[PDB]
Amino acid sequence: PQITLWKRPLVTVKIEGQLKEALLDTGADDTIFEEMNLPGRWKPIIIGGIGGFIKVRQYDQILIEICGHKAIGTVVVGPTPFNVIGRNLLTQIGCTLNF
Amino acid sequence: PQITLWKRPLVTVKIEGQLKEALLDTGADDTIFEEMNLPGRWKPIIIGGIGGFIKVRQYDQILIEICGHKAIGTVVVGPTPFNVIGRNLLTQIGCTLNF
Numbered sequence: 581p582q583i584t585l586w587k588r589p590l591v592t593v594k595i596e597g598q599l600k601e602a603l604l605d606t607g608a609d610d611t612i613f614e615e616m617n618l619p620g621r622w623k624p625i626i627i628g629g630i631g632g633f634i635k636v637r638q639y640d641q642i643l644i645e646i647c648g649h650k651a652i653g654t655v656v657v658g659p660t661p662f663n664v665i666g667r668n669l670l671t672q673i674g675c676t677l678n679f
Numbered sequence: 680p681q682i683t684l685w686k687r688p689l690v691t692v693k694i695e696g697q698l699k700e701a702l703l704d705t706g707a708d709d710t711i712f713e714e715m716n717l718p719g720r721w722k723p724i725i726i727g728g729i730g731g732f733i734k735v736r737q738y739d740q741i742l743i744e745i746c747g748h749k750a751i752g753t754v755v756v757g758p759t760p761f762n763v764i765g766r767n768l769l770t771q772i773g774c775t776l777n778f
């Protein structure tokens with residue numbers, strides 16, 4: 581689909597059988613979600629944004645189906661105000677900026 | 680232009696006669712740059728990110744020429760790690776996400 585930027589680019593996402601709405605974020609290198617359980621071993625890491633840093637649990641080879649397109653990649657879980665689909669998964673679905 | 684997301688979507692921008700590189704950020708509602716001087720009256724405001732909040736000076740009707748395309752809108756000045764072009768200005772240049 582083509583997505584204008586007049587409203588937040590939110591998309592419905594299915595992850596580990598759960599339905600969530602996530603932000604298509606070209607400014608995010610990685611994907612981060614609110615607190616939730618995920619398969620596989622995780623490593624505690626820290627990510628930095630505008631105004632500070634947060635501790636998060638890193639998961640690898642996580643399946644996400646975002647707006648009907650499937651992708652596997654690293655997914656980070658922590659206290660984020662919004663679920664963010666970062667470039668690590670945007671590339672997988674063939675997402676591009678165009679103007 | 681078409682912009683894939685394998686690398687950071689950095690673009691060269693001219694603002695107040697200054698040359699800067701800025702991040703095309705679909706996850707940012709507003710545009711914010713590192714410390715710099717700008718015309719017009721400003722109001723101190725606060726913005727929130729992934730790991731906290733920062734105090735910033737808000738400027739309205741600021742001209743930016745991003746990749747050769749012109750836009751006027753609110754520009755926020757504060758301690759951001761990267762210059763970010765938010766949706767308030769992305770919409771003006773006709774920026775869209777496509778997949």
Ligand SMILES: CC(C)CN(C[C@@H](O)[C@H](Cc1ccccc1)NC(=O)O[C@H]1CO[C@H]2OCC[C@H]21)S(=O)(=O)c1ccc(N)cc1
Nearest residue numbers: 605607608609610628629630661706707708709727728729
């Ligand atoms: C630090 C910047 C490069 C911005 N980043 C992505 C960006 O889209 C965030 C994504 C985002 C969105 C909502 C809340 C927090 C973070 N938005 C943002 O910070 O914008 C702020 C300025 O305009 C305001 O609009 C809301 C946020 C404010 S980030 O959240 O910190 C980030 C950094 C690293 C990773 N792996 C993932 C995300």
